[PDB]
Subunit: 124 residues, 4 copies
Amino acid sequence: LIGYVRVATNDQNTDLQRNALVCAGCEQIFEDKLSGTRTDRPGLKRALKRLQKGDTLVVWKLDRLGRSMKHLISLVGELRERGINFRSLTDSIDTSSPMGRFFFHVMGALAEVERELIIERTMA
Amino acid sequence: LIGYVRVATNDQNTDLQRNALVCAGCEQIFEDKLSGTRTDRPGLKRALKRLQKGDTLVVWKLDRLGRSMKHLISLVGELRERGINFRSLTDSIDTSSPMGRFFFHVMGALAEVERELIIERTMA
Amino acid sequence: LIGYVRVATNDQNTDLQRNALVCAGCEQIFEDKLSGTRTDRPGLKRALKRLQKGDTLVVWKLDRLGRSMKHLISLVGELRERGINFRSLTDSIDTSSPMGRFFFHVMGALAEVERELIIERTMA
Amino acid sequence: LIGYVRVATNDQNTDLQRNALVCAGCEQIFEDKLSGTRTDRPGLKRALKRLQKGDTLVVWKLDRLGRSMKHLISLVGELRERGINFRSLTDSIDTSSPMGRFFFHVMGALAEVERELIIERTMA
C-alpha cells in the first residue's frame, strides 16, 4: 500500500519509478538521497511512522533499499512479527506466505553476496 | 576451534556427535537442554564468553542451533563484524569467504522455511 | 498418485517408508536395489510406464532418487512438458506451481553440490 | 576464452557489451539475432564448434543466452563432463569449482522462474 524509492542525486529517473509504483497500486510517496550513507536510513524513518498492521510495503528492487542482508533480514522480519507484510515488484516476491519468504531471503542473500563480490573486485 | 551440540533430554546421541566434532578438530565442549525454550539460549551464553577474534565455530547441523533464520543471521553476522568466522560440518559450509556466506544463508533460509512449513502442517 | 523408494540391499527400512507414502496418499508400489549403479534406472523404468498425464509423483527425499541434478532436472522437466507434475514429501516441494518449481531445483541444486562435496572429501 | 552476446535486432548495444568482454579477457566474437526463436540456437552452433577441452565460456548475463533452465543445465553440464568450464561475468559465477556450480544453477533456477513469472503476468 505504501511506496519508497532510492537514488543518488538525480531525480528524473525516480519519476518513471514513481509512475510504475502508482500503477502497481500504492498510496503514498517516499524518496531519499544517497549522498552520505546508504545503510543509515534518512527519510525512510517516516515510512516506518506512517505504517500500520495488515498494510504492505512497495519496493521496485531489493538492491535499491540497503543491500546488506544482515541489516535487511533484521528489519523486514520485525514487521513479519508486527503483523505487516512486504512485496517486491520486479524482484517478484512477497513475504505474505512462508513459501514466499523463501525467494525473498535468497534474493536478499544474493543482493548482499552481489555487493560483497562487486566491492572486493575494486581492490585487486 | 570450539564446539556446541543441541538435544532434547537424552544424552547418549550427543556422545557420537561429540566424537565426530573432536575428530573434525575442535578444543572445547558445550551442550544444552531443549526442555523449556529452543530460541532462548541457555549454556550457549558461555560459548559466546570463551570465544575471541580469529577463532571459529563448530556446528554439526544448522537446524540443531535455533532454526529461526531471523534470529540466526542476526547473530552470526555479528561475529562476521567482530572478526570471528563460522563453519558448519555436515551442512558443509563456511562463512570465511563471501562466496561461502551464500550457501550458509540459503541453508539458513531453508532451515527456517523448513520449520515454517513443518509447523503449519500440524494445524490442518 | 504413484510412489517410489530407493535403498541399498536391506529391505526393512523401506517398510516404514512405504507406510508413510501410503498415508500421504498414493496408489502403487515401486522399489529398487542400489547394488550396481544408482544413476542407471532399474525398476524405475516401470514407473515411467504406468504413469499418465495429470497424475503425480511421490518421493520421500530427492536424494533417494539419483542426486545428480544434471540428470535430475533433465527428466522431471520432461514431465513438466508432458503434463505430469511432481511433489516431494519431507523435502516439502511441488513442481505444480512456477513459484514451486523454484524450491525444487535449488533443493536439487543442493542435493548435487551435497554429493559433489561429500565425494571429494574422500580424496584428501 | 571465447565470448558470445545475444540481442533482438539493434546492434549498437552489443558494441559496449563486446567492449567489456574483450576487457574481461577473451579471444573470439559471436553475436546472434533474436528475431524468430530464442531457444533455438543460430550462430551459437559455431561457438560449440570452435571450442575445445580446458577452455572456457564468456557470458555477460545468464538471461541473455536462453533462460530456460531445463535447456540451460542440460548443456553446460555436458561441457562439465567434456572437460570445458564456464564463467558468467556480471552474474559473477564460475562452474570451475563444485562450490561454484551452486551459485550458477540457483541463478539459472532464478533466471527461469523469472521468465516463468514474468510471462504469466501477461495473461491475467
